[PDB]
């Protein structure tokens, strides 16, 4: 679990969005596993606007942060799960690192701010949904 809180927006994994997220929907994209909802309180986070390919992510299944080298955002095949059919997920970045079900929502940060959130994983890989192209989160 986990979310990004920026300005009057909350960014979550679309597959983990609550009834309240859907009732306050701003934008969602099943191909990216992202959903953004509106909030009344001002957020705590800032978003990176960069091309970093290294950073640090929070891994809730280890209660620890780990450094990662990750690929540029791209279209990646993701196997069927209870949440989605087998499909290509867009704007996804892969890295070698631990992840297990329950870790989605962990934040990836570089020196510039928030890069994205954990969205996929398996067998020593971890995949992050990029948010750096969503320029409207800042205004």
Instruction: Report DSSP letters for 1-15, one per residue.
Output: ---EEETTEEEEEGG
Is 90 within 8 Å of 33 (Cβ atoms)?
no
d(CA 108, CA 116): 5
Within positions 40 to 79, which residues make up the interface with Zn ion, using CB under 5 A?
Answer: 48, 50, 52
CB of 7 to ligand A1B5A, least distance (A): 25
Q: Known catalytic residue: 104?
A: yes
Active-site option among 59, 91, 103, 104: 104
- Virtual torsion, Cα 14, 18, 23, 28, nearest 10 deg: 0
Site stretch for ligand A1B5A (CB under 6 A), options 19-27, 35-43, 51-59, 118-126: 118-126
| Binding-site ranges for ligand A1B5A (CB under 6 A) | 15, 33, 78, 81, 83-84, 89, 99-101, 103-104, 118-122
Known binding residues for Zn(2+) are: 50, 52, 110, 112
């Amino acid at each position: 679990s986990g979310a990004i809180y920026v300005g009057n927006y909350r960014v979550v994994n679309r597959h983990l969005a609550t009834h309240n997220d859907w009732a306050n929907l701003v934008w969602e994209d099943s191909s990216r596993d992202l959903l953004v909802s509106s909030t009344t309180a001002q957020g705590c986070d800032t978003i990176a606007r960069c091309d970093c390919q290294t950073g640090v992510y929070y891994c809730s299944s280890r209660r620890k942060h780990y450094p990662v080298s990750f690929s540029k955002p791209s279209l990646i095949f993701v196997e069927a799960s209870e949440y989605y059919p087998a499909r290509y997920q867009s704007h996804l970045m892969l890295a070698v690192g631990h992840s297990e079900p329950g870790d989605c929502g962990g934040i990836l940060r570089c020196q510039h701010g928030v890069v994205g959130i954990v969205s996929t994983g398996g067998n020593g890989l971890v995949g992050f949904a990029d948010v750096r192209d969503l320029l409207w989160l800042d205004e």
